[PDB]
Symmetry: C3
Subunit: 149 residues, 3 copies
């Protein structure tokens, strides 16, 4: 019974208890800090969040952020009725996806050489910075990427 | 000899054994989960895989994916003989690099203002969505980025 | 006093000592390797470094790299006085942000359909690959992304 302490300790040195081990699937809590190099050979799974935005004018926008920091933007739909400098007219970018500093992402017009970009800005509005688009709409594709913080 | 258990345990509390320690270089196996914040100050090394594609029409394409999720695309070569809507004619994107949902990446024509984009789609075909290109080829550069899953 | 060894060991199996635990905030040193899948539910914080470059001709360039590998480029200012093929005239990209292989990032001209790209190359020079720009300057925005190694 004095020797159980030992047996039981030679068990926590293998799995169970509050000890992280060199094998098994385990869970870990708290602000871990790693000063040296680290490596993952398998899959590392950072948190994901995705958001759909009808930016207005016909401009669809699917944003996909991972670990709150880098978000990839996928341009869809078709824009119409905007001036060279205008702030887009539809749904704003949600708090969770809004940049700290302004970020211009570059889209392209489907089946054309003409191009455009839009500014996501911290407040979450999206100003347009392509040429003045007429009532007759043009399809807008292309992927953007910006650091959230 | 009763006290060796102890000595030997006060060793696994330092290194060796199946225990992860606050120092040394160690290896770890199994689906580790980290509920709290984590930090790396050194280098974190996620798995890398790179792929070269002759998309056809003269369009070179070097894809580089890291941790199976985000791949950066580097456009090379020069495209010729394609319509505004056509599916590119050469080697398809391999299974390991194929998106779940379609992704348009935006390239640019070297020494010109004219631009283009192409669609990588889940099956791995690459449809072209720039203007109709004549027999006389044009050089295509620019980097794209898309989430694999 | 023989039993303190035990008490003291049943403490290092909880926190303190050189042992990583399933709870608390701890620090870790050395080349950790993770063969299995890993997961982070909170925030994972990779090292960050940001750099501002006056590329010359009026082309501003803010580069932001994370974990030394992927850097997002933010184009600013306005370019003027460059030929279709020229190497930009102002401050070069610093060693810490210079790619191994050349990377073209695609910018866009503010309030226009016209587009451009520039080549960051390993030595750190930035060759321009848009159309020949006159003395009258044009504003240049858009975000790029390239793998550093």
């Amino acid at each position: 019974t004095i020797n159980d302490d030992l047996e039981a300790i030679n068990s926590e040195l293998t799995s169970g208890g509050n000890v992280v081990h060199k094998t098994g699937d385990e869970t870990i809590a708290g602000k871990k800090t790693f000063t040296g190099n680290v490596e993952v050979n398998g899959s590392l799974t950072l948190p994901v969040q995705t958001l759909t935005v009808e930016a207005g004018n016909g401009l669809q926008l699917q944003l996909t952020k991972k670990n709150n920091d880098l978000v990839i933007v996928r341009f869809f739909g078709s824009v119409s009725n905007i001036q060279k400098g205008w702030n887009m007219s539809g749904t704003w970018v949600d708090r969770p996806f809004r940049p700290a500093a302004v970020q211009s992402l570059v889209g392209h017009f489907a089946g054309r050489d003409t191009s455009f970009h839009i500014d996501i800005n911290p407040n979450g509005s999206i100003t347009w910075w392509g040429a003045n688009i007429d009532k007759t709409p043009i399809a807008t594709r292309g992927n953007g990427s910006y650091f959230i913080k």
